[PDB]
Amino acid sequence: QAAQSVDQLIKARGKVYFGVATDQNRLTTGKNAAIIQANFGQVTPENSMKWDATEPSQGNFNFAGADYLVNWAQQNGKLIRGHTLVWHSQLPSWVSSITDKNTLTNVMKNHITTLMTRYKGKIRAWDVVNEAFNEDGSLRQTVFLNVIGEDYIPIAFQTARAADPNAKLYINDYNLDSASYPKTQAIVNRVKKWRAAGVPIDGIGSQTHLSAGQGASVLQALPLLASAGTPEVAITELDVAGASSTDYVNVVNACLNVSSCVGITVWGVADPDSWRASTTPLLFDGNFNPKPAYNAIVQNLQQ
For the chain, the domain total comes to: 1
What resolution (Å)? 0.9
Distance between CA atoms of residues 20 and 265, nearest Å: 5
CATH of the domain at 81: 3.20.20.80
Distances (CA, A) of 77 to 41, 72, 205: 7, 9, 22
Backbone dihedral angles phi then psi of residue 276, each to the nearest 5 degrees: -130, 55
Distance between CA atoms of residues 28 and 87, nearest Å: 27
Instruction: Tell me which method was used to determine the 3D structure.
Output: X-ray
Q: Which residue range(s) make up the domain with 53?
A: 2-303
Backbone dihedral angles phi then psi of residue 36, each to the nearest 5 degrees: -65, -45
**What's the N-to-C CA distance of the chain in angstroms?**
22
**For the CA atoms of the chain, what is the radius of gyration?**
18
Q: Where are the beta strands (DSSP E) in the chain?
A: 17-22, 42-45, 79-86, 125-130, 168-173, 203-206, 209-210, 232-240, 261-266
Active site residues: 131, 237
Cis peptide before 159 (omega within 30 of 0): no
- Dihedral, CA atoms, 294, 131, 64, 29, nearest 10 degrees? -30
Determine contact, residues 271/20, Cβ cutoff 8 Å.
no
